[PDB]
Amino acid sequence: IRAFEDPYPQVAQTLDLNTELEEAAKFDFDNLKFRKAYFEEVHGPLEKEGVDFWWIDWQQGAISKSGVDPLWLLNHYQYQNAQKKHKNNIILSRYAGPGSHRYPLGFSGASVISWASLDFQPYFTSTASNIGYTWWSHDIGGHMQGYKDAELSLRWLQFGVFSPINRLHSSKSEFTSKEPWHFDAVIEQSMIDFLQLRHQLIPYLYSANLITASEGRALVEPLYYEYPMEEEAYQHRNQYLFGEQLMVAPITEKMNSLLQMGSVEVWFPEGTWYDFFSGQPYDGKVSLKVYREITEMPVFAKAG
Amino acid sequence: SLRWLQFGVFSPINRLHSSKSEFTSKEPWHFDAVIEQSMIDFLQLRHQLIPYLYSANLITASEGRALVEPLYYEYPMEEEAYQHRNQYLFGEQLMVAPITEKMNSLLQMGSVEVWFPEGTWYDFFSGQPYDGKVSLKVYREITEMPVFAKAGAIIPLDKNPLKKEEIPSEIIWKIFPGADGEYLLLEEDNETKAEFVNGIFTVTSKKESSRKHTIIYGEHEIVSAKRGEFSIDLNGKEENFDWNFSTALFRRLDIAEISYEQKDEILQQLSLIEEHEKQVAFIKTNENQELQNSLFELLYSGK
Amino acid sequence: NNNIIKFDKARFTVLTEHLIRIEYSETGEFEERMTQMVQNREFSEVNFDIIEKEETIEIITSTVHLYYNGGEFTNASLFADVKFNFSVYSNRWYFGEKSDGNLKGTTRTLDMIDGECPLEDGIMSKNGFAVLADKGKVLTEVGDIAGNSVSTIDLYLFAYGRDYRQALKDFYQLTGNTPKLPRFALGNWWSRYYDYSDKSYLALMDKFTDKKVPLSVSVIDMDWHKVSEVPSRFGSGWTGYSWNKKLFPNPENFIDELHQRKLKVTLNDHPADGIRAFEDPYPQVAQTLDLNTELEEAAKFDFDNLKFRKAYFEEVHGPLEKEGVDFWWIDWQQGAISKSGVDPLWLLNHYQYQNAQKKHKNNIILSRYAGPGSHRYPLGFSGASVISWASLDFQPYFTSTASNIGYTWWSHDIGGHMQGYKDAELSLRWLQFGVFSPINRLHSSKSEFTSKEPWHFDAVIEQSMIDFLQLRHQLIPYLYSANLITASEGRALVEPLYYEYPMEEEAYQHRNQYLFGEQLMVAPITEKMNSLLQMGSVEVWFPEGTWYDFFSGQPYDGKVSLKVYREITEMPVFAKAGAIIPLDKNPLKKEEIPSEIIWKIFPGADGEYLLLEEDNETKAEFVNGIFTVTSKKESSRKHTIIYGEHEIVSAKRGEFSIDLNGKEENFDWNFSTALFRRLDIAEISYEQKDEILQQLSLIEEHEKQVAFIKTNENQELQNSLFELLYSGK
């Protein structure tokens, strides 16, 4: 809190700063008095204007006098402070090491906009369950730099809708808005359809959320949680269970222009499986390349 | 399919036809929503053009003038009139340069090298201007076709192309500002002369009728559904089309499948650099050769 | 001092508003002695503010907040915020951590480097701060190593923002200014790793004269001493202090012959194997150092040892200096190990530079870079570069970046040292760069195939090399004046663009472009020519203003980035409207100072040039079209004036003024002639040449000439034609 800020006069009084030399209240989350002034005199007035929860966007390193990562101090203390004004409140912040699942939500940050970034992200998301960090929020469509491709934006939103959190976000570019109507009529209508589907899924998500909190079961599981002895459950990095009723195989590669379809190799466990959207059937157990138009996503449900 | 229909609409006859395949129907709704809407738009345009076509038809029959002329009919001594095989005059008021090559996926635009004869030319659809005489590569999205009219051009259009009626009950007179012009609409049982002289637009007909005339001067509808012969002064009215460099630049950068850092730098530098020659020097450094030519077309139109 | 603050076990010295010394001492004693790096901590008093509490201290200057929370220095206890917004969150220094933004400095050597190598940090940063750690030993008052500092941590925080020139000036105040070079250092040097005789070396020097190539320096490489004649029980012949008597039967007579030709003479010294029992000076050195001669005990290299240094200067170098050797080429490649912990290369450069001043005023060495402060011991010797386009393409960037740690007299082997590949065009481009570099020393490997003699190459390459070598001597007045400005004002001859244009992003995007003194901007071509154009190219950033090609007068309107094309015989060098460049009219004439100066004036603006010389200052002024020359001291010098194209005044003595308002401002350079020449040399179809010449001649409107070239199927030909159209706009 530097001397130009609206809350500086109050913070300066509380922390006994030299205002004629414009002494800054430097960030120091090791300091009880700094934390109190931060929550009460900096965040407090903004909460009084109606701010519901804090997006903690920390990128300035792991240095403190205590040896505790400032990101851990922010997530721990801010999550606790958020509970004062709202029940079951959240933050939005980067991962701060094992145990930091106690402070949801995860914020993965400034991904490069690319097919490569999208192709990593389902694997990234399901693997995080292996250290209990089950509420990653990715920038849907990628954050910054990289390249324009409306199909990449659409595939990324398909994944986002079947991810822990569906937060559209972008860079300071004039050219990277995630608004569906940024794109052509086909892409726009598909994005609107998927965004409506996310809200259709809120009952299923909210129920799975209470199961994470009460039973320690991740919403997103790697295949090998359910199928630990099947070698194919370790060979489909981007395939996952989404709650207990759905199995997702996102397409994360640009379509083959000769087919006008993208594809992913799906492992179908033993049993009868249906495409969630079309009812197309599949007899497990089999590994099978599946093809979808850019407007369609491979999501499967078992008989029953 | 879409590029072929664009050409067909500006050809002598627009007959959709196909093979015995289950897969080759020319129905617009065979294709995705973007292609379908563009095909419907072009098919409606063909019927808007029937007055112009029918008048040119009576000129073929009575005066021995082709509807479709090679450039060298009008420009026999210009070497460039022999070097643009697919470019043609379409009646006396329109010059067509169809795009007949698959789009550059980095630009999301197709292109054709256009020869602009001496004079001021406008895109028929957008009003984008071009100073002749010049040979210039022009870029269009798959939904847009390069068709041009000179300053002073007058093109009649059917206002009600869907309406079943033997002759149009309403004509739009579409006027390109910047010069005098004239158009004679020959019909089954009438002749209607539109004159544009020293900024005065006059419509007269051999025989009276209940036809309602609409006047579009550049951008703006001036007169709506006016009956009978009349004159109106357009010297006071706005000559300029809306088309502008900045809007067109933003649109070309936004659809391009290129790096966002390149989009950001081009938009910022072309906005900041004031001197036209230095805007051209900036685009000349671009690693993307075809992107240079697309940006050059916008700068040339904005000169 | 009021500019000194102690807190806990730390000491802070506010040297300038932008320069703070930071010390830690476990013993409560802080270091006042000079170090290898630091020669002076006397700075004028400055204002600053302190917030001192029980447990913390903050020092506040115009540009930095320095914080210390007490205890040992850690990234958490010692840190600083700059009062700048060059970055969004790279404005904080943490003790012992790296931040983004450093514009780099230099490195020891280009030995064995093919193209790029990593550089050390300098004191310049785009984000406005840099820390320079002083890890050196302390010196005595007379400049010998005294051992470990009592300041066990000793740092300099530079917080100059993008005032790079002031940062460098204050660096020179802290570390000592560069000494003045002698005028002879700025001429052409001849060098070759080749076993010349006295006879064949003098024949080559006389061939340079016959060929109209001026030289200032004769280098004699290691085959001057015994090599194959060294018995293998002694090790190699790499180190030597004994003339090969077959090649040099009368060394003093041979050096006398070079001195009669007005050449300065240096010998290669490989010091690392010291003075072994076969050497001519060994009996004297053995007596002085009490060596066991019956066991042939070597005087091993030990520059930590005062007695060894004295025997080295007095009994090894001394006899060779008495035969006429003018200065030493210290060629050290055998590592950084000594008992003291001081790099032997630093001990050699420091002590040899000091010793060279005994026999000649403003004398030099030639040696590799020995860390910050070693600019006190010019000249820099970059060493055994690989002969490649990649090496040449690195070297302008390397040279200008070195100014960021104050090391402004790099001498590169012109044309590359060793290995690599033959390409006469690479040799010619490398010489073009060399002529516009700090030092122009031709040198090469032990190959029969790597001589840098111009007449090694075909008639076209030979004539171009001779022309550039003559140009180097024409430039000696300009170089020597810039040399005195380095010594007195702390301004580098070669500056990165960002010294002059710190807020222009394009000044950071043209790595090989530089300012060369204050009147010239150089963009060397460092890529093989496009054979379709028969021309090489470089993207040039032209700052705001009207610029002229120094050679042709081709004009360019800044500000613009523009690809420029030159034949292999031509180099992109530019001067602004109003530029005044002095040239020696008689570069082949042996004379201590020029008897005639050409004043080359670029029209279109006012200008000024101060020619500093050994015993004079001459001011050329160009104000409202009046050109005036005055000097502190009268002389018989004859002045020639070239205003743009035309010689106005020929060989005029004394001070004078002349009005040039009536005279032709315009250069001859014209679009049509240049267009015809580029089309004529191009290896393209004749039908394309015919069409371009006809269409560009016929089409009148500039915008339509540009539209015509935009349709060309040859992308690089478009850019070449665009450069001509841009200059002709």
Ligand SMILES: OC[C@H]1O[C@H](O[C@@H]2[C@@H](O)[C@@H](O[C@@H]3[C@@H](O)[C@@H](O[C@@H]4[C@@H](O)[C@@H](O)O[C@H](CO)[C@H]4O)O[C@H](CO)[C@H]3O)O[C@H](CO)[C@H]2O)[C@H](O)[C@@H](O)[C@@H]1O
């Ligand atoms: O709250 C904003 C944003 O912050 C995080 O992500 C950042 C990301 O969006 C991006 O931002 C940069 C800015 O840092 C700023 O950078 C300039 C740079 O463009 C250039 O002009 O040079 C200067 C000087 O060196 C930089 O300082 O503005 C540009 C736009 O031109 C933005 O792209 O990059 C930084 C660094 O990687 C990110 O920290 C956060 O993760 C994100 O969610 C949030 O929206």
